[PDB]
């Protein structure tokens, strides 16, 4: 249930270099070593070795030849009189929920990395305010979406985790005998995520959820485009200074400045790309707004007053409502 | 990997408060004053591999370094029985006398002189760890020594390692009184400009409201710097509490700061903590009291005609609570409309549930620490800027900055700092309005 | 709450509810209702009337508790609570509009008269009905052990309170409702005119008209009380100390 | 949400009264003299925060601000076991030395100097409140320092928030003993002008009746100010019972106040207390005693110029009483016509039954306090007005104001005040017609 955090954080940290590779190019041989070395790295090493041996990483076919982010999975095999329950039917739901939360956490870390990149780059674009304006709009839309995803994911985390664990614990603790233990435990644990969190409506909303997730990848691509643009301006400045060297190159710097009289055409070209970048950012911003509002209306009309309350947490100060 | 944070104790006050913080951490983790594990320190769940590095003999040696331009405070800290907590490699003895005279220029120049004598230590402490989340710098902007030293070191670290979280604990001098160092506002302004240029998330620490709470909420006729440091160390150590619970959420400082900061220039966060004492409470009481302008440690000026929007509101709640309580408390506060948000980018009031350490003696059910990105602090900045402006109008005590030729050659550094601060304040003013997208 | 032993809730309930009670149902936010309710704890067809609201309250019982209190008793409690809600909101509408400082507007006597009338009605009705009826029901239950007799005691208390209160005359018929309606119209028009001025001849003419309507309704209600209900409220009443 | 009021203790007399009432409130709520909750005296189901704010550790820090140019009074009040109840930053300290020295002009002018400071402090206190229902002020119109200070403060407050209720408790001069201040009638008239033109509600607190009752009605030869203050604090504690202890109706201060004031000019109210404190008990007799000018704390005679009739009367009752005795007492008194009504009498004596606090020693199953409006208080104004007129016709005691610049150009304001008060009196005489 991703309670560890640092375990999962470092897990996806190490999986980033791998799951980027095509699913075909992967090897569970190295994946198991990654798993075990991460567990030895994290606090899970301080827990019981029996549960540790109960864990296991698997390569769960999800995409034919796509990134390995999709096909990675954990199995946590438990068999025999040990956990006779779950009938290998509840563990399927557990695996599905694991995939769901895995995608959610991955896109969260994506957002965090993008904001880290923004903060790193900002101290480098303070000499070029023309790119600063578009970085302003970029950051504003990025923060918008990042706050929205953070809020929704934290809300669902609190809801699902608290309800599930609290009810299971209390019911099993209060249940006098095994028949009730097994029945109530398994039924509640299955029902919380099977139907309450999954239905035709659930997948319909998951549609726009994954849409805005890919919006995240799109914005990362735009970020890297602007980052290569920033590198281009940086190298422009660097060659400026390197050819100048304060007139100790003298004739070299003279001809360098004579040429950069022409190269200022390149600065003007970047300036002209600036409105192109602004337009392509604004169009993505508008599409993200539209899909967000469609998702909001959809879920608000759909069901589960709790998630509507989460939405009002999201829509605090009334920016939605068409 | 568990990212660490390196502590930078600067100036007399910064070193004092850093020691207070480190002792608070030691108390929380339940370790001996020597840094050896206890029978009630390692059997819990608190992750002590975030601020202390585990040794080969169960020594959680702090990830902190002691720097000063006068060795007397260093000797006093050594006299503490918590000198055994730290390694001597973790400690640098001042080779300067009398600090820097509480001058920004003097501290900056001396930090320039000790460039590598600190760089070696910092690189050793860095490469001794696998991965670092960032830096934490305890300092006092009032002390010109630490102010200049911190400005120099922030410049150096930002240049050399542009890959860590830059956090500083900036002691804001009292606005309740004027100190003998009348050039203190310029020093602070220079430091503030550095923060604007360098820092990424500022937890403001005003001494005026600290004095106020001490007189009222600690009930002392004349608060002492030591008890103030004690209380502030307590309140600030409460912050990292979520970082010590790896059971709910990723809860990484980089992400937590990023969840609220809109711009690397607008990176200034308020403080406010409950309970304050020298009984019975529910969730709704927590934020209900936090909304009151009585438990804030950051004060503003006399402004009441300019609306101020809480840009971001977050609260860490340490104690045993129920999810229904939080779910209803949020909705209830929102419906009561005790807060505001930017109209164009409207946000919500984030909550962080966490549970108390068993080795922390608990006498209360809940404990709340607020983190607010808000506009009132501009007034304080204005309070400083005006204090600067009139001083710059008086052109007094500039011989202090003519001692160091860097400022004797030109005082334009002060002018640029003032301009940057004014730009930031106008940025805040614009953020108060929906047109901020255009700005 | 049902018999109104906590008005501190009621004050902010009232501050919040008329933001929506002016609007049709299903066009509002029911959630806010409970959002305020949880706040509070921080501090045949003629036998049902046609003026009942779709809903304005919520409370639930349990299986053992349901064994005793029926839905009909809950409906009667809700109806009486709605009557009190009406009275109280009219009251503090008048209270709010009252505030002023420092001539030719006049009508101070009219508002003071109507305020005193409604205050007396509220106090006398509530005291007379709930205090002794509730206490006697308590004593009967404490003296009884037959569960069927317990139910008889509760039914008798509820029926007696039914024969009292606003439906002390089930064929009044809500003439006091017309009185309060014209009263609230007067308060609204007064606020309109004050907000406008912050003609006065028309203001005084409307004042005279509203005084005439109030006097007419008051005379009708006094006649109904004097004919038969109970003039104990009329005993309190003696606008005018005297009759016609 | 609950509505609270800021307490305003001005002048030496006002500060003493405020401290006594704070002590009485502390007793009523069962809180520690440090304000912390008790494990033995704070467990009741009620609201102990109506003029306070509870702390995290359950300190009811009071809504207390004390303004007196005499720093000795402030220092003495600080020297108390209850200094741990108040908020130190909620109390300003005067650094003017002796202050106005009981002069209306001096205090009124000096209130202008800290005008911004006092507004700042009141706004800071109000900001913490979620719903500040109004302002409450206790002072003495006789104390010239306090008199001028309160005049300036009422003006500034009416300027500041017209939206808050203005309730004042004015300590009227002792008429049993003429004050040593000769311009004292002038000070009182100026204060009464400010009250009339700014104060939403005025409850009369006559030191004459207080003195007579203490010397005589409490069977103690002592007219001592301390005993007077103790009895006054008892009266005020009786006043706030239905507010502090949750009743049934009129649990709001606005509903209480608005019932007795029909005009934005007639805001002068009288009070009485029952039982008087040094066989069987009946509801009727307690208020029948309250109907006799012996246990009434207002020294107002019964001279006849116009018919003096009680416009409306409310009685607060401490302890349990069946409503039948209440109603029968009402009917019997109305047959007796013990309370005269205006030619269109709109209301009788409305009763208010309140639950008694179990944290106090139960010694009165029946204790009641009188609330009424009755034009005879205008006589005391006239008693002062004739005092003013004789003071005015002396053509003396204006050199004190001439030394200052408040009254060194024209004393016409003194006349305008006397005019407005006269108008008030006439209006009182016109009420019964």
Tab-separated table of N, CA and C in Angstrom, chain D residues 108-235:
chain	number	residue	atom	x	y	z
D	108	UNK	N	-9.979	64.723	27.696
D	108	UNK	CA	-10.488	64.725	26.329
D	108	UNK	C	-9.391	65.066	25.328
D	109	UNK	N	-8.558	66.058	25.644
D	109	UNK	CA	-7.473	66.412	24.737
D	109	UNK	C	-6.403	65.330	24.695
D	110	UNK	N	-6.081	64.731	25.842
D	110	UNK	CA	-4.999	63.758	25.858
D	110	UNK	C	-5.420	62.462	25.187
D	111	UNK	N	-6.718	62.153	25.199
D	111	UNK	CA	-7.206	61.028	24.427
D	111	UNK	C	-6.944	61.174	22.948
D	112	UNK	N	-6.786	62.408	22.472
D	112	UNK	CA	-6.469	62.613	21.067
D	112	UNK	C	-5.044	62.183	20.756
D	113	UNK	N	-4.147	62.251	21.742
D	113	UNK	CA	-2.748	61.937	21.479
D	113	UNK	C	-2.553	60.445	21.235
D	114	UNK	N	-3.137	59.601	22.084
D	114	UNK	CA	-3.037	58.158	21.893
D	114	UNK	C	-4.225	57.669	21.076
D	115	UNK	N	-4.926	58.598	20.421
D	115	UNK	CA	-6.090	58.226	19.625
D	115	UNK	C	-5.755	57.099	18.657
D	116	UNK	N	-4.667	57.264	17.906
D	116	UNK	CA	-4.238	56.213	16.992
D	116	UNK	C	-3.834	54.958	17.747
D	117	UNK	N	-3.132	55.110	18.868
D	117	UNK	CA	-2.704	53.937	19.620
D	117	UNK	C	-3.904	53.157	20.137
D	118	UNK	N	-4.894	53.863	20.681
D	118	UNK	CA	-6.060	53.195	21.243
D	118	UNK	C	-6.891	52.545	20.144
D	119	UNK	N	-7.050	53.229	19.008
D	119	UNK	CA	-7.728	52.604	17.878
D	119	UNK	C	-6.983	51.360	17.426
D	120	UNK	N	-5.656	51.431	17.381
D	120	UNK	CA	-4.859	50.291	16.954
D	120	UNK	C	-5.081	49.115	17.888
D	121	UNK	N	-5.050	49.372	19.192
D	121	UNK	CA	-5.189	48.292	20.159
D	121	UNK	C	-6.583	47.689	20.077
D	122	UNK	N	-7.606	48.526	19.915
D	122	UNK	CA	-8.959	47.992	19.855
D	122	UNK	C	-9.149	47.190	18.579
D	123	UNK	N	-8.566	47.649	17.475
D	123	UNK	CA	-8.677	46.908	16.227
D	123	UNK	C	-7.933	45.583	16.314
D	124	UNK	N	-6.747	45.591	16.922
D	124	UNK	CA	-6.013	44.353	17.152
D	124	UNK	C	-6.820	43.375	17.989
D	125	UNK	N	-7.500	43.869	19.021
D	125	UNK	CA	-8.308	42.974	19.838
D	125	UNK	C	-9.512	42.464	19.056
D	126	UNK	N	-10.145	43.340	18.276
D	126	UNK	CA	-11.330	42.954	17.520
D	126	UNK	C	-10.999	41.961	16.417
D	127	UNK	N	-9.806	42.069	15.835
D	127	UNK	CA	-9.432	41.175	14.748
D	127	UNK	C	-9.408	39.729	15.216
D	128	UNK	N	-8.907	39.490	16.426
D	128	UNK	CA	-8.900	38.139	16.951
D	128	UNK	C	-10.293	37.566	17.105
D	129	UNK	N	-11.263	38.405	17.449
D	129	UNK	CA	-12.628	37.926	17.589
D	129	UNK	C	-13.192	37.538	16.231
D	130	UNK	N	-13.933	36.431	16.211
D	130	UNK	CA	-14.642	36.033	15.002
D	130	UNK	C	-15.941	36.809	14.836
D	131	UNK	N	-16.688	37.005	15.924
D	131	UNK	CA	-17.913	37.809	15.895
D	131	UNK	C	-17.960	38.684	17.145
D	132	UNK	N	-17.407	39.886	17.031
D	132	UNK	CA	-17.451	40.866	18.109
D	132	UNK	C	-18.833	41.505	18.106
D	133	UNK	N	-19.630	41.239	19.140
D	133	UNK	CA	-21.010	41.700	19.113
D	133	UNK	C	-21.112	43.196	19.358
D	134	UNK	N	-20.139	43.784	20.044
D	134	UNK	CA	-20.185	45.212	20.288
D	134	UNK	C	-19.070	45.645	21.215
D	135	UNK	N	-19.303	46.780	21.860
D	135	UNK	CA	-18.369	47.392	22.789
D	135	UNK	C	-19.068	47.534	24.131
D	136	UNK	N	-18.340	47.260	25.208
D	136	UNK	CA	-18.827	47.489	26.561
D	136	UNK	C	-17.796	48.329	27.291
D	137	UNK	N	-18.265	49.362	27.986
D	137	UNK	CA	-17.374	50.317	28.622
D	137	UNK	C	-17.846	50.622	30.032
D	138	UNK	N	-16.909	50.577	30.972
D	138	UNK	CA	-17.150	50.907	32.367
D	138	UNK	C	-16.208	52.036	32.752
D	139	UNK	N	-16.746	53.072	33.376
D	139	UNK	CA	-15.978	54.279	33.667
D	139	UNK	C	-16.761	55.094	34.688
D	140	UNK	N	-16.291	56.310	34.950
D	140	UNK	CA	-16.989	57.252	35.814
D	140	UNK	C	-17.031	58.598	35.112
D	141	UNK	N	-18.241	59.129	34.929
D	141	UNK	CA	-18.388	60.477	34.400
D	141	UNK	C	-17.912	61.525	35.393
D	142	UNK	N	-17.831	61.179	36.680
D	142	UNK	CA	-17.309	62.119	37.667
D	142	UNK	C	-15.800	62.292	37.538
D	143	UNK	N	-15.063	61.199	37.371
D	143	UNK	CA	-13.632	61.306	37.175
D	143	UNK	C	-13.302	62.045	35.896
D	144	UNK	N	-12.813	63.279	36.033
D	144	UNK	CA	-12.623	64.119	34.862
D	144	UNK	C	-11.633	63.525	33.883
D	145	UNK	N	-10.550	62.943	34.395
D	145	UNK	CA	-9.644	62.190	33.540
D	145	UNK	C	-10.424	61.163	32.736
D	146	UNK	N	-11.077	60.240	33.443
D	146	UNK	CA	-11.888	59.247	32.773
D	146	UNK	C	-13.020	59.852	31.973
D	147	UNK	N	-13.596	60.958	32.446
D	147	UNK	CA	-14.722	61.552	31.731
D	147	UNK	C	-14.305	62.026	30.343
D	148	UNK	N	-13.250	62.836	30.273
D	148	UNK	CA	-12.770	63.301	28.984
D	148	UNK	C	-12.237	62.170	28.129
D	149	UNK	N	-11.519	61.230	28.749
D	149	UNK	CA	-11.013	60.084	28.008
D	149	UNK	C	-12.157	59.313	27.372
D	150	UNK	N	-13.218	59.067	28.136
D	150	UNK	CA	-14.345	58.326	27.609
D	150	UNK	C	-15.085	59.099	26.540
D	151	UNK	N	-15.185	60.419	26.696
D	151	UNK	CA	-15.789	61.220	25.638
D	151	UNK	C	-15.017	61.054	24.334
D	152	UNK	N	-13.696	61.220	24.402
D	152	UNK	CA	-12.875	61.069	23.208
D	152	UNK	C	-12.985	59.657	22.648
D	153	UNK	N	-12.996	58.656	23.526
D	153	UNK	CA	-13.039	57.271	23.077
D	153	UNK	C	-14.373	56.934	22.433
D	154	UNK	N	-15.475	57.416	23.000
D	154	UNK	CA	-16.773	57.179	22.388
D	154	UNK	C	-16.841	57.823	21.016
D	155	UNK	N	-16.337	59.052	20.895
D	155	UNK	CA	-16.299	59.690	19.583
D	155	UNK	C	-15.490	58.856	18.597
D	156	UNK	N	-14.301	58.425	19.013
D	156	UNK	CA	-13.424	57.682	18.117
D	156	UNK	C	-14.031	56.339	17.740
D	157	UNK	N	-14.691	55.676	18.688
D	157	UNK	CA	-15.289	54.376	18.418
D	157	UNK	C	-16.473	54.513	17.477
D	158	UNK	N	-17.316	55.519	17.701
D	158	UNK	CA	-18.425	55.738	16.789
D	158	UNK	C	-17.903	56.057	15.401
D	159	UNK	N	-16.771	56.758	15.324
D	159	UNK	CA	-16.110	56.949	14.041
D	159	UNK	C	-15.594	55.632	13.472
D	160	UNK	N	-15.138	54.721	14.331
D	160	UNK	CA	-14.393	53.553	13.873
D	160	UNK	C	-15.312	52.483	13.293
D	161	UNK	N	-16.197	51.925	14.114
D	161	UNK	CA	-17.115	50.879	13.669
D	161	UNK	C	-18.529	51.255	14.081
D	162	UNK	N	-19.289	51.889	13.190
D	162	UNK	CA	-20.714	52.111	13.466
D	162	UNK	C	-21.496	50.822	13.590
D	163	UNK	N	-20.944	49.715	13.108
D	163	UNK	CA	-21.650	48.448	13.026
D	163	UNK	C	-21.690	47.680	14.340
D	164	UNK	N	-20.951	48.098	15.363
D	164	UNK	CA	-20.932	47.374	16.624
D	164	UNK	C	-21.832	48.044	17.657
D	165	UNK	N	-22.403	47.214	18.530
D	165	UNK	CA	-23.270	47.689	19.602
D	165	UNK	C	-22.487	48.539	20.591
D	166	UNK	N	-23.068	49.673	20.973
D	166	UNK	CA	-22.453	50.566	21.945
D	166	UNK	C	-23.202	50.519	23.270
D	167	UNK	N	-22.747	49.660	24.178
D	167	UNK	CA	-23.304	49.538	25.519
D	167	UNK	C	-22.287	50.099	26.505
D	168	UNK	N	-22.749	50.937	27.428
D	168	UNK	CA	-21.870	51.587	28.386
D	168	UNK	C	-22.429	51.473	29.794
D	169	UNK	N	-21.518	51.353	30.755
D	169	UNK	CA	-21.848	51.343	32.177
D	169	UNK	C	-21.124	52.544	32.771
D	170	UNK	N	-21.866	53.623	32.986
D	170	UNK	CA	-21.318	54.881	33.472
D	170	UNK	C	-21.554	55.002	34.971
D	171	UNK	N	-20.478	55.218	35.723
D	171	UNK	CA	-20.581	55.427	37.161
D	171	UNK	C	-20.977	56.880	37.397
D	172	UNK	N	-22.227	57.088	37.789
D	172	UNK	CA	-22.744	58.426	38.000
D	172	UNK	C	-22.186	59.011	39.295
D	173	UNK	N	-22.041	60.330	39.363
D	173	UNK	CA	-21.456	60.939	40.560
D	173	UNK	C	-22.316	60.684	41.787
D	174	UNK	N	-21.650	60.574	42.932
D	174	UNK	CA	-22.350	60.516	44.206
D	174	UNK	C	-23.010	61.856	44.494
D	175	UNK	N	-24.322	61.817	44.694
D	175	UNK	CA	-25.112	62.969	45.097
D	175	UNK	C	-25.371	62.989	46.594
D	176	UNK	N	-25.097	61.882	47.285
D	176	UNK	CA	-25.038	61.914	48.739
D	176	UNK	C	-23.927	62.835	49.218
D	177	UNK	N	-22.864	62.978	48.430
D	177	UNK	CA	-21.719	63.796	48.807
D	177	UNK	C	-21.274	64.583	47.586
D	178	UNK	N	-21.264	65.908	47.710
D	178	UNK	CA	-20.834	66.764	46.612
D	178	UNK	C	-19.343	66.577	46.371
D	179	UNK	N	-18.973	66.384	45.109
D	179	UNK	CA	-17.572	66.203	44.761
D	179	UNK	C	-16.773	67.483	44.980
D	180	UNK	N	-15.496	67.301	45.320
D	180	UNK	CA	-14.577	68.421	45.477
D	180	UNK	C	-14.327	69.152	44.166
D	181	UNK	N	-14.545	68.494	43.034
D	181	UNK	CA	-14.412	69.137	41.733
D	181	UNK	C	-15.616	70.041	41.515
D	182	UNK	N	-15.356	71.330	41.295
D	182	UNK	CA	-16.458	72.260	41.101
D	182	UNK	C	-16.967	72.166	39.673
D	183	UNK	N	-16.080	71.914	38.712
D	183	UNK	CA	-16.489	71.844	37.316
D	183	UNK	C	-16.986	70.426	37.071
D	184	UNK	N	-17.124	69.653	38.148
D	184	UNK	CA	-17.648	68.297	38.039
D	184	UNK	C	-18.997	68.260	37.345
D	185	UNK	N	-19.943	69.148	37.649
D	185	UNK	CA	-21.169	69.180	36.843
D	185	UNK	C	-20.886	69.424	35.376
D	186	UNK	N	-19.919	70.288	35.069
D	186	UNK	CA	-19.543	70.508	33.677
D	186	UNK	C	-19.033	69.219	33.049
D	187	UNK	N	-18.154	68.509	33.755
D	187	UNK	CA	-17.610	67.269	33.215
D	187	UNK	C	-18.724	66.262	32.982
D	188	UNK	N	-19.634	66.147	33.945
D	188	UNK	CA	-20.728	65.198	33.823
D	188	UNK	C	-21.618	65.559	32.646
D	189	UNK	N	-21.908	66.847	32.469
D	189	UNK	CA	-22.742	67.268	31.351
D	189	UNK	C	-22.066	66.977	30.020
D	190	UNK	N	-20.767	67.250	29.918
D	190	UNK	CA	-20.059	66.956	28.677
D	190	UNK	C	-20.076	65.463	28.387
D	191	UNK	N	-19.901	64.650	29.427
D	191	UNK	CA	-19.940	63.211	29.226
D	191	UNK	C	-21.337	62.765	28.830
D	192	UNK	N	-22.366	63.354	29.432
D	192	UNK	CA	-23.716	62.922	29.113
D	192	UNK	C	-24.083	63.337	27.701
D	193	UNK	N	-23.573	64.484	27.255
D	193	UNK	CA	-23.732	64.885	25.864
D	193	UNK	C	-23.124	63.844	24.942
D	194	UNK	N	-21.901	63.413	25.254
D	194	UNK	CA	-21.261	62.405	24.419
D	194	UNK	C	-22.039	61.096	24.446
D	195	UNK	N	-22.552	60.712	25.613
D	195	UNK	CA	-23.339	59.487	25.714
D	195	UNK	C	-24.590	59.582	24.854
D	196	UNK	N	-25.298	60.702	24.960
D	196	UNK	CA	-26.534	60.886	24.214
D	196	UNK	C	-26.265	60.876	22.719
D	197	UNK	N	-25.191	61.530	22.291
D	197	UNK	CA	-24.922	61.681	20.874
D	197	UNK	C	-24.136	60.514	20.298
D	198	UNK	N	-23.629	59.610	21.136
D	198	UNK	CA	-22.791	58.528	20.640
D	198	UNK	C	-23.176	57.171	21.222
D	199	UNK	N	-23.722	57.134	22.438
D	199	UNK	CA	-23.920	55.869	23.142
D	199	UNK	C	-25.269	55.255	22.771
D	200	UNK	N	-25.241	54.011	22.279
D	200	UNK	CA	-26.469	53.300	21.929
D	200	UNK	C	-27.318	52.940	23.146
D	201	UNK	N	-26.688	52.622	24.276
D	201	UNK	CA	-27.401	52.257	25.497
D	201	UNK	C	-26.626	52.778	26.696
D	202	UNK	N	-27.333	53.392	27.642
D	202	UNK	CA	-26.733	53.886	28.877
D	202	UNK	C	-27.500	53.345	30.075
D	203	UNK	N	-26.811	52.582	30.922
D	203	UNK	CA	-27.358	52.085	32.178
D	203	UNK	C	-26.877	53.007	33.290
D	204	UNK	N	-27.815	53.537	34.066
D	204	UNK	CA	-27.495	54.516	35.101
D	204	UNK	C	-26.880	53.816	36.306
D	205	UNK	N	-25.734	54.327	36.762
D	205	UNK	CA	-25.032	53.823	37.944
D	205	UNK	C	-24.783	55.010	38.873
D	206	UNK	N	-25.752	55.313	39.733
D	206	UNK	CA	-25.693	56.500	40.580
D	206	UNK	C	-24.908	56.198	41.851
D	207	UNK	N	-23.816	56.937	42.068
D	207	UNK	CA	-23.072	56.785	43.311
D	207	UNK	C	-23.863	57.266	44.519
D	208	UNK	N	-24.916	58.057	44.313
D	208	UNK	CA	-25.719	58.516	45.440
D	208	UNK	C	-26.464	57.352	46.077
D	209	UNK	N	-27.187	56.587	45.259
D	209	UNK	CA	-27.904	55.427	45.771
D	209	UNK	C	-26.937	54.368	46.269
D	210	UNK	N	-25.813	54.186	45.576
D	210	UNK	CA	-24.809	53.243	46.052
D	210	UNK	C	-24.325	53.632	47.442
D	211	UNK	N	-24.022	54.914	47.636
D	211	UNK	CA	-23.544	55.380	48.931
D	211	UNK	C	-24.608	55.184	50.000
D	212	UNK	N	-25.850	55.558	49.689
D	212	UNK	CA	-26.922	55.445	50.671
D	212	UNK	C	-27.177	53.991	51.040
D	213	UNK	N	-27.114	53.094	50.058
D	213	UNK	CA	-27.382	51.688	50.322
D	213	UNK	C	-26.248	51.091	51.140
D	214	UNK	N	-25.002	51.412	50.786
D	214	UNK	CA	-23.879	50.840	51.515
D	214	UNK	C	-23.884	51.336	52.952
D	215	UNK	N	-24.078	52.641	53.146
D	215	UNK	CA	-24.030	53.178	54.497
D	215	UNK	C	-25.193	52.639	55.316
D	216	UNK	N	-26.346	52.456	54.673
D	216	UNK	CA	-27.585	52.102	55.353
D	216	UNK	C	-28.095	50.727	54.947
D	217	UNK	N	-28.299	50.487	53.649
D	217	UNK	CA	-29.017	49.295	53.213
D	217	UNK	C	-28.230	48.017	53.453
D	218	UNK	N	-26.909	48.102	53.582
D	218	UNK	CA	-26.101	46.946	53.934
D	218	UNK	C	-25.647	47.002	55.384
D	219	UNK	N	-26.374	47.742	56.222
D	219	UNK	CA	-26.168	47.743	57.667
D	219	UNK	C	-24.686	47.860	58.005
D	220	UNK	N	-23.982	48.704	57.256
D	220	UNK	CA	-22.602	49.057	57.558
D	220	UNK	C	-22.464	50.569	57.496
D	221	UNK	N	-21.937	51.164	58.566
D	221	UNK	CA	-21.760	52.610	58.589
D	221	UNK	C	-20.833	53.070	57.473
D	222	UNK	N	-19.995	52.175	56.971
D	222	UNK	CA	-18.962	52.520	56.005
D	222	UNK	C	-19.588	52.884	54.668
D	223	UNK	N	-19.341	54.078	54.146
D	223	UNK	CA	-19.679	54.351	52.745
D	223	UNK	C	-18.553	53.942	51.812
D	224	UNK	N	-17.667	53.074	52.302
D	224	UNK	CA	-16.383	52.851	51.656
D	224	UNK	C	-16.567	52.547	50.176
D	225	UNK	N	-15.673	53.114	49.365
D	225	UNK	CA	-15.687	52.855	47.931
D	225	UNK	C	-15.460	51.385	47.616
D	226	UNK	N	-14.659	50.689	48.421
D	226	UNK	CA	-14.444	49.267	48.178
D	226	UNK	C	-15.735	48.469	48.310
D	227	UNK	N	-16.535	48.747	49.337
D	227	UNK	CA	-17.797	48.029	49.480
D	227	UNK	C	-18.769	48.393	48.366
D	228	UNK	N	-18.777	49.663	47.967
D	228	UNK	CA	-19.597	50.083	46.838
D	228	UNK	C	-19.202	49.314	45.588
D	229	UNK	N	-17.899	49.216	45.336
D	229	UNK	CA	-17.417	48.488	44.171
D	229	UNK	C	-17.771	47.012	44.251
D	230	UNK	N	-17.682	46.418	45.438
D	230	UNK	CA	-18.051	45.014	45.572
D	230	UNK	C	-19.511	44.809	45.199
D	231	UNK	N	-20.389	45.660	45.721
D	231	UNK	CA	-21.803	45.518	45.398
D	231	UNK	C	-22.067	45.794	43.923
D	232	UNK	N	-21.354	46.756	43.342
D	232	UNK	CA	-21.514	47.030	41.918
D	232	UNK	C	-21.097	45.828	41.087
D	233	UNK	N	-19.961	45.222	41.422
D	233	UNK	CA	-19.536	44.025	40.709
D	233	UNK	C	-20.552	42.905	40.860
D	234	UNK	N	-21.174	42.795	42.034
D	234	UNK	CA	-22.254	41.827	42.188
D	234	UNK	C	-23.399	42.128	41.230
D	235	UNK	N	-23.758	43.404	41.112
D	235	UNK	CA	-24.819	43.809	40.194
D	235	UNK	C	-24.464	43.416	38.767
